[PDB]
Amino acid sequence: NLYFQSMSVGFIGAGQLAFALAKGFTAAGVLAAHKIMASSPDMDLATVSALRKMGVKLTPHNKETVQHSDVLFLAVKPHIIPFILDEIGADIEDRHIVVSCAAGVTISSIEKKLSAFRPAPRVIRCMTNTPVVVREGATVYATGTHAQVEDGRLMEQLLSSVGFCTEVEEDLIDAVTGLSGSGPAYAFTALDALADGGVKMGLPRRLAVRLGAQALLGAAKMLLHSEQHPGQLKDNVSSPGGATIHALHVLESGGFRSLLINAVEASCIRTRELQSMADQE
Amino acid sequence: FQSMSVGFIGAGQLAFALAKGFTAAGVLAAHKIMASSPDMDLATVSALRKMGVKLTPHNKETVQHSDVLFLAVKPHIIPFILDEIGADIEDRHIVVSCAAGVTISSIEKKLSAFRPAPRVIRCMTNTPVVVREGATVYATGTHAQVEDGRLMEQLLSSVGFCTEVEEDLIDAVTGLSGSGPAYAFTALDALADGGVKMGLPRRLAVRLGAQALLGAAKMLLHSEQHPGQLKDNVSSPGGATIHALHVLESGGFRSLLINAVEASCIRTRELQSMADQE
Amino acid sequence: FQSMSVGFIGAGQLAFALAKGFTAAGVLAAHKIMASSPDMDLATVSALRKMGVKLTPHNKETVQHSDVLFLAVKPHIIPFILDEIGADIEDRHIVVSCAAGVTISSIEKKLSAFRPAPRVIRCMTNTPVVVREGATVYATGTHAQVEDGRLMEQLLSSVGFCTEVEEDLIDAVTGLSGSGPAYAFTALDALADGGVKMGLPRRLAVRLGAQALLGAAKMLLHSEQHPGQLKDNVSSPGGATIHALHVLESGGFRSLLINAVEASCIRTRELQSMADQE
Amino acid sequence: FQSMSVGFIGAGQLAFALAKGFTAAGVLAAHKIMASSPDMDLATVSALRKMGVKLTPHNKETVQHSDVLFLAVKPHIIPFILDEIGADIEDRHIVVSCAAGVTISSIEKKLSAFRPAPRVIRCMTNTPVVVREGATVYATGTHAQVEDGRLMEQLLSSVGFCTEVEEDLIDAVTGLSGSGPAYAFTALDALADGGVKMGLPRRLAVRLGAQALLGAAKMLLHSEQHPGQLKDNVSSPGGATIHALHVLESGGFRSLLINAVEASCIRTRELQSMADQE
Ligand SMILES: NC(=O)C1=CN([C@@H]2O[C@H](COP(=O)(O)OP(=O)(O)OC[C@H]3O[C@@H](n4cnc5c(N)ncnc54)[C@H](O)[C@@H]3O)[C@@H](O)[C@H]2O)C=CC1
Ligand SMILES: NC(=O)C1=CN([C@@H]2O[C@H](COP(=O)(O)OP(=O)(O)OC[C@H]3O[C@@H](n4cnc5c(N)ncnc54)[C@H](O)[C@@H]3O)[C@@H](O)[C@H]2O)C=CC1
Ligand SMILES: NC(=O)C1=CN([C@@H]2O[C@H](COP(=O)(O)OP(=O)(O)OC[C@H]3O[C@@H](n4cnc5c(N)ncnc54)[C@H](O)[C@@H]3O)[C@@H](O)[C@H]2O)C=CC1
Ligand SMILES: NC(=O)C1=CN([C@@H]2O[C@H](COP(=O)(O)OP(=O)(O)OC[C@H]3O[C@@H](n4cnc5c(N)ncnc54)[C@H](O)[C@@H]3O)[C@@H](O)[C@H]2O)C=CC1
Ligand SMILES: O=C(O)Cc1ccco1
């Protein structure tokens, strides 16, 4: 029974993440689509067309998003953030809460830009993922220097309506990016391959996709609802000498676990490397 | 309002998961379920008992109690079971075998020596029925009535996805969604290790990794888009995700999952070939 | 335009391919093209002559003839060429650099020492322009006029795909479509070896393999569907194609192609840093 | 001929692709084509209807309509189909089996039980016939007339490359050009991932990669030169392309493509031995 009646939300950038969050928020019923505005220099993108059909207000001008909004999501690529902040920094008012969703971009770098125009900008950094579109996102956030206590509580209330949300120290966010930010892509890759395996063994593709995705969804839910270690839940599936333990062995023989560790590491490291380039630039 | 009595021959992991799912769905009262095992010292048996399920060592009592009778013992036990209680199967019974690899033909051959038209259904499910997100398929036997298949689909749809298949798909289903949760638990453990390696507390890394997988699976189930397209929507040019996807590809990540589904399916077939040789 | 004169500094593989494509397309008569090379006894020089292209050893002659001037020499020769003809560039000239890696900045710096505001365009194309199926991108320089980009796009579209990009994408395009034909020739040689191993005559295996790759590429270009969806359409359950796809996955086939694009792009960037260092 | 009526038993991917190609080519009006499938609520069935193709659930109707009858069902359904329509084949009919692996011998044996001297042709094609760039081979049966092969070659040439082969080459052709589009779709997906990793937008990377592969394939088909010579032409000394070729070689890129052709051919042979065993 949550609803932010006095909240106007804006998105700078009207791409995949802006669509995903706007769809999640509106499906959650916590925001009316007409209370959301999004801006982009390309009003002929597929994401803009979808936002328009939801009822979201669209404009090419970032200043109009700022003037309309109370909560301002920065949903542009990381290298575009500094250009955006210089463009609308003079338009940031006392009432604004600036929420950066950009991978890698630090609170410090955002506050430095905006503070040149008006002291004490209220900044929150978040990392989320596309499953907010089905209200099953994984979101962490960190509060900036001038964010009020109620700013973080409000953002946690808003982002909890589209999935899991918790506050973290900012120095964890690049690692979260490599785990749950990039995580859905790992899962889509795994599901494509599991379906290929189903097809190889005789299943129609449509059924193999549905079963593989259902298997992954159910296993993730079991772990989230259980206090047992993932190894114990695994032991419950595998009968002695059975089909599952035979399959687990061939995963182990290929270093399956190490590949997923490799992936989280590589995404985290790249996130740190890109920001180190941005700060040197 | 069915007042259906359900029995499980076998009181292990699957019987517990199904019983927990059915009672949480509200389709069955726990005390309308009876389960039998010769080993009451199992943890699964104590959980079933705590739920309020009726427990007995005697498989005949389970049969006489049941309207729908699940066979939840290990595949090599099924023929012993059918010899033992085949005389107790009645015309009213629907026999649902959950055993990996065991064919409808092998079951009907045993039971037909007693009464002539045993109603047999074969199913393959998985442990997430315990949270009502199972993936279940079933095939109907020679004498199963149209209403038997519909009843079975109503029942198993209460604990997750359920669909009828031809029996010759079920071994492949076993390798995919039957064994699938174990592949996911392995992946989630490793994803969490990667989170920990990069500085996350273990508890948070497990939570985030599992939420990521749940969300991605739901996205795919709710999308008409190809999983490759959903993947392309995550990865921006030059970005973190595409760098991570590259290291997965360099290890043959896709081939490992194909290998797993194949290995489980083949083992399922190989066991049954040895079973029907005996 | 019809009255448009085109020149090539460098009369080698790329100049031949572009001139063959342009004249085959009908957008340029061969007699409107001049090419220069210091060795007039070259195979490409002979081929260009037979087509009707004007040839000369003097790069100054090419400049004086041309309106649109392509630079088709190896990248380390570009600075030498610019110093040789810089005093000969007029305001009518559009200088189109085809050299891998060489930046508009480096070209404009050399030419601006002679006459301010050189009109420079940088492009990256590939040898299939010779059969009018090239893949070309281009970026406009500081003083290139809007019509200059439109003229270049009209010209290069006659021999394949052409689109404007920001210059900072061109090194990656080089690794993908610039080097791409070489990846395909390697793949076609190996696919033909596979056909021969399985009993096909070499000539038939080459023809079938090349036709399969051409057809598949055209399907993808004409489809809105994801390449994985088109792949799914071809793989029947249990069939030959999904069996072969597995062995590709088990070798990390995908990661090798990613490796190749990356290695070509990185080498392109490295060669240009070496150029700028001096 | 114009008065030629064509039928498809099986209204799935292949039947759609051939009918789309035939009608796009102008060799057949859609109203001269009938296709049959037991599920008239299929995506391919709908698409065929919009094109103007006559649809029916009755395979007998297709036979009665057709002069040239394509068999486009899965290989394990061919014997069932032949038993269903065998009594309906006339002397006017040319039966063209597209099924992977299925021998002319097995088809002629089933049809000869109903009427002697069935005119049978076996072909292997691929889905790029949908854009008129297929690769097709065919072998003529015992009672096929000389004009029957010439008619089939004229028809299939309208949608791509077509040549007659001895039947014992067709399983290897299946592994090369039959499965080949799937190898190319995998390669194009991975090449696009490489472009994205190096900073290209996904849509541009897909377009460039597909255009590069199409252009290279067309170059090879139009050249008399060896694919290694064309590769040599593209690799400048010390350059980006030869650096990328090295990383392909270091992964055994060539051996993976050989592996794939082999695995598809062997699986084709194995499936047909399973067919003949029963
Ligand atoms: N897609 C994902 O999986 C997630 C993305 N993010 C972050 O969200 C941000 C956007 O991600 P996507 O939405 O995937 O990018 P996207 O590329 O789909 O959308 C980017 C949007 O920015 C717009 N844009 C470019 N220049 C602009 C300007 N000067 N002013 C306003 N808009 C401008 C583009 O037109 C486009 O609509 C990135 O910083 C990314 O790291 C964070 C979590 C997950
Ligand atoms: N655990 C899983 O993930 C799934 C298992 N299955 C199938 O379910 C069946 C059992 O699986 P689990 O429950 O995991 O095995 P489990 O080993 O946990 O329990 C097996 C039960 O059979 C009982 N049992 C042994 N001999 C018996 C007899 N003569 N009469 C009655 N009960 C007897 C054991 O005491 C134990 O309670 C197997 O056929 C397996 O293939 C199917 C889907 C998934
Ligand atoms: N062939 C390819 O695959 C593509 C090549 N390119 C670029 O095009 C340029 C040339 O490529 P290729 O034609 O393959 O090289 P190539 O070596 O076949 O031709 C080079 C030509 O430059 C001539 N030349 C050398 N010094 C000269 C001078 N001082 N004045 C005039 N001409 C001189 C040589 O005599 C030769 O005719 C390179 O920068 C390459 O990066 C770009 C697109 C694709
Ligand atoms: N798609 C490809 O890549 C190529 C396929 N082929 C061969 O063509 C045949 C079909 O290929 P796809 O069209 O990909 O299969 P598909 O599964 O897309 O279409 C199969 C069609 O057969 C229909 N069907 C099933 N039982 C039937 C029956 N009793 N009577 C009539 N129709 C029935 C199905 O309803 C479906 O419409 C296979 O033998 C395959 O080997 C050969 C060349 C290339
Ligand atoms: O691993 C085994 O044999 C049991 C099983 C069947 C399906 C999933 O697990």
UniProtKB/Swiss-Prot annotation, chain A:
Subject to competitive inhibition by the reaction product proline. Subject to competitive inhibition by stearoyl coenzyme A. One of its GO terms (biological process) is regulation of mitochondrial membrane potential. L-proline binds at E170, A243, T244. InterPro entries: 6-PGluconate_DH-like_C_sf (IPR008927), NAD(P)-bd_dom_sf (IPR036291), P5C_Rdtase_cat_N (IPR028939), P5CR-like_CS (IPR053790), P5CR_dimer (IPR029036), Pyrroline-COOH_reductase (IPR000304). Keywords: Acetylation, Amino-acid biosynthesis, Disease variant, Mitochondrion, NADP, Oxidoreductase, Phosphoprotein, Proline biosynthesis, Stress response. It catalyses: L-proline + NADP(+) = (S)-1-pyrroline-5-carboxylate + NADPH + 2 H(+); L-proline + NAD(+) = (S)-1-pyrroline-5-carboxylate + NADH + 2 H(+). Its EC number is 1.5.1.2. It is found in: Mitochondrion. The keyword Electron transport does not apply. The keyword Calcium does not apply. Gene3D superfamilies: NAD(P)-binding Rossmann-like Domain, ProC C-terminal domain-like. Belongs to the pyrroline-5-carboxylate reductase family. Homodecamer; composed of 5 homodimers. Interacts with LTO1. Oxidoreductase that catalyzes the last step in proline biosynthesis, which corresponds to the reduction of pyrroline-5-carboxylate to L-proline using NAD(P)H. At physiologic concentrations, has higher specific activity in the presence of NADH. Involved in the cellular response to oxidative stress. NCBIfam families: proC. This is Pyrroline-5-carboxylate reductase 1, mitochondrial. The gene is PYCR1.
